[PDB]
Each structure stands twice: as C-alpha cells, then as structure tokens.
Amino acid sequence: MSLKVNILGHEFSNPFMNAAGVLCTTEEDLRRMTESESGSLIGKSCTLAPRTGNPEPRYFGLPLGSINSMGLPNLGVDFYLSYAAQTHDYSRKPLFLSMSGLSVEESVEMVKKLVPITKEKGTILELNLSAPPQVGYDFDTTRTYLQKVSEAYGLPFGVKMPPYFDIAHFDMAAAVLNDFPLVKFITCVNSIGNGLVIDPANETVVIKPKQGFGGLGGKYVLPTALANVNAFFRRCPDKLVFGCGGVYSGEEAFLHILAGASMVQVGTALHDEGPIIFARLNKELQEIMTNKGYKTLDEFRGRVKTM
C-alpha cells in the first residue's frame, strides 16, 4: 500500500509530520525531524524578534496528554528563514514554517521575508491564528489577518486554527476562510486552550504561567480534532485539511484521514517518545490499510460513514 500524499506539487512519503512547537525550535531539533521517518516537518511558531518564552515550570506531561504555556519561545524569523534557505535538505522531505506574529503587522513583515525562499525552495507557510486573545475566536480579526497576509505573501499558504465547539462557529469560520483562495490548507487543531491541572497532594497548579492555565494536548483532544477536521473538510472543499490532535497510533491517524485529513501532525506523543514514533506510525497505518484492502489514502480520506 502507499502512504504517499501529493499536495502543492510536492510528494510526501507519508502523511506524518510534527505538530508545530514540538521538536522544531532549534537546528538540532529540525535535523532530528528531517532524519526521522516523517513525511514533513514544521518549524516552531516564530516571531519577528527572538523570544525566551514563559517562566518555569511551563510544560507538564500528563497520563492523558499534556498541558503547556510555553510563551512562543523561538530563535526569531531570521533563524527559521535561514534554515529554510541554506540548511534544510529538501531532498529528504518538504519543509513547512509556522509564523505567529502577535499582531497582523508583525505577521505581515515576517511573511514578506518568506516570499523569496518559498519561490526558490518551496517552503510552505502555516499561519498560526491560535496562539495563546486567540485570533480564530474573532472572525473579524481573522479576516483582517487573511486579507493582509494574502496580499503580502501572495502565495499558497495554510492556517493553524483553534478548536471550535459550536456548529455555527464552524460555519462562521468556513465563511471567512472561503473568502481567501490562497488558503489551501487548514490545520485542525491547536491545543484545547486554557485548561487547569491541579496536583491534589500539594493543592497546587502544575504550571507557573497564567495561574496554571495552559493548552491541553493528547488523548483529551482526539474527538474535538476529528470533528473540526470533518467540519472543515465538508465546508471548505476548495481546500485541504491537516489533522492535529490526539495521535498516538496508526489508528488515530486512520481516523483523522477518514475524517478528511491530508497530513497528520503529532505533538504530545512525539514530546513523549521522540522522532522514532514516525517509524511506528507508518507501520501501523500500513497494517490497518492492508487489513481493510485500501491501497491509497485517497481511497478512504473523508469517507467516514454516517448513520
């Protein structure tokens, strides 16, 4: 069977990639992702200038997933642009970059710098609209960001969206996104935002920033992610959907693809296991496809049955 995905002119060996934020902040991280069995990789959501991020502790591994308030620690746009122009081996896998300016102006200035590298190297942009006020939760601000970034970048790009939990919100988000033809992929989803974990032994929160409030990832998010994937697969047929959330196995990948996902992103589980996970995910998805008699992902993508 084939795990290949053919999108934006590129051939991906498999649908699997890292979720933005995990094993993607430094050059060592990026080499490790490139040397992995992953089909692609994405860089840490970057800012115009370097950020060191939030105070410690800011990450807590849970039995059911993860909580985090990292604070967008990143080496700055110039670092990721340089990796994309001079360091990355595009013969290994295609490269994506996440940009998370804390204002539309910052995002425009960054996006402008990427244009020449995309043209020469094929580096794909994922605009983050779900950085912990979340842009995805204001449909007016979202339109402004897509307007301004579409004009500045002038090239195909995608968007990391916050999870929606309302059918009307799926509709309202789809209506904005469908007014922007340069948005070719929608990544669903970012962390379930602003959760609180408390340790019963010390009666204390487990992360220092934001009084313990942090984004939830892992097993807590699979149902939410699958829903967002399917809702945007159906409402945005002129676009691709990338799945992110709750993937620990080939089974969860299969479910993401069945819901409509082209690429599948792994976060918490990759934070837990390391890049060796990509080799397990390829093997498990292959086994599932072999058992169901699917020869390509295209035979079942978005083909989830309803009653």
Ligand X SMILES: Cc1cc2nc3c(=O)[nH]c(=O)nc-3n(C[C@H](O)[C@H](O)[C@H](O)COP(=O)(O)O)c2cc1C
Ligand Y SMILES: O=C(O)c1cc(=O)[nH]c(=O)[nH]1
Is residue 70 involved in binding ligand Y (CB under 6 A)? yes
CB distance 187 to 242 below 8 Å: yes
**What CA–CA distance (Å, rounded) separates 133 from 130?**
9
Work out which of 117, 205, 266, 289 binds ligand X, going by CB under 6 A.
Answer: 266
Interface with ligand Y in residues 130-189 (CB under 6 A): 130-132
172 sits in which H/E element: helix 167-177
The stretch among 114-122, 126-134, 241-249, 288-296 that binds ligand Y (CB under 6 A) is: 126-134
Interface with a copy of itself in residues 124-153 (CB under 8 A): 133-134, 137
3-class SS of residue 134: coil
Work out which of 34, 36, 54, 68 binds ligand X, going by CB under 6 A.
Answer: 68
Query: Which amino acid makes up residue 65?
Result: G
3-class SS of residue 152: helix
Helix axes 222-235, 250-259, angle to 10 degrees: 30
Is residue 77 involved in binding ligand X (CB under 6 A)? no
Q: Which residue has the tokens 């340790």?
A: 199
The stretch among 3-11, 72-80, 95-103, 252-260 that binds a copy of itself (CB under 8 A) is: 252-260
Work out which of 14, 107, 191, 282 binds ligand Y, going by CB under 6 A.
Answer: 191
**Ramachandran bin of 158, using left for φ above 0, alpha for ψ from -120 to 50, beta for the remaining angles:** beta
**What CA–CA distance (Å, rounded) separates 5 from 289?**
15
Work out which of 31, 210, 235, 280 binds a copy of itself, going by CB under 8 A.
Answer: 210
Is residue 245 involved in binding ligand X (CB under 6 A)? yes
Q: Which is nearer to a copy of itself, 12 or 254 (CB)?
A: 254
CB of 87 to ligand Y, least distance (A): 22
User: What single string gives the DSSP state of each residue in 68-110?
Assistant: E-----B--HHHHHHIIIII--TTT--EEEEE--SSHHHHHHH
Q: Which residue has the tokens 């991280």?
A: 29
Is residue 175 involved in binding a copy of itself (CB under 8 A)? no
Q: Which is nearer to ligand Y, 69 or 282 (CB)?
A: 69
CB of 74 to ligand Y, least distance (A): 8
Is residue 258 involved in binding a copy of itself (CB under 8 A)? yes
CB of 82 to a copy of itself, least distance (A): 34
Cβ of 306: how many Cβ atoms within 10 Å? 4
**Ramachandran bin of 181, using left for φ above 0, alpha for ψ from -120 to 50, beta for the remaining angles:** alpha
Is residue 164 involved in binding a copy of itself (CB under 8 A)? yes
Choose among a copy of itself, ligand X, ligand Y, none what residue 137 binds, the Cβ cut-off being 5 to 8 Å by kind.
a copy of itself
Q: Which residue has the tokens 């976060």?
A: 267
Q: Which is nearer to ligand Y, 136 or 260 (CB)?
A: 136
User: What single string gives the DSSP state of each residue in 44-73?
Assistant: EEE-SS-B--SPSP-EEEETTEEEE-----
CB of 190 to ligand Y, least distance (A): 5
> Which stretches of the chain bind ligand X, using CB under 6 A?
19-22, 44-45, 59, 66, 68, 70, 72, 98, 128, 130, 160, 190-191, 217-218, 221, 244-247, 266-269, 271
> Which stretches of the chain bind ligand Y, using CB under 6 A?
21, 45, 68-72, 128, 130-132, 190-191, 215
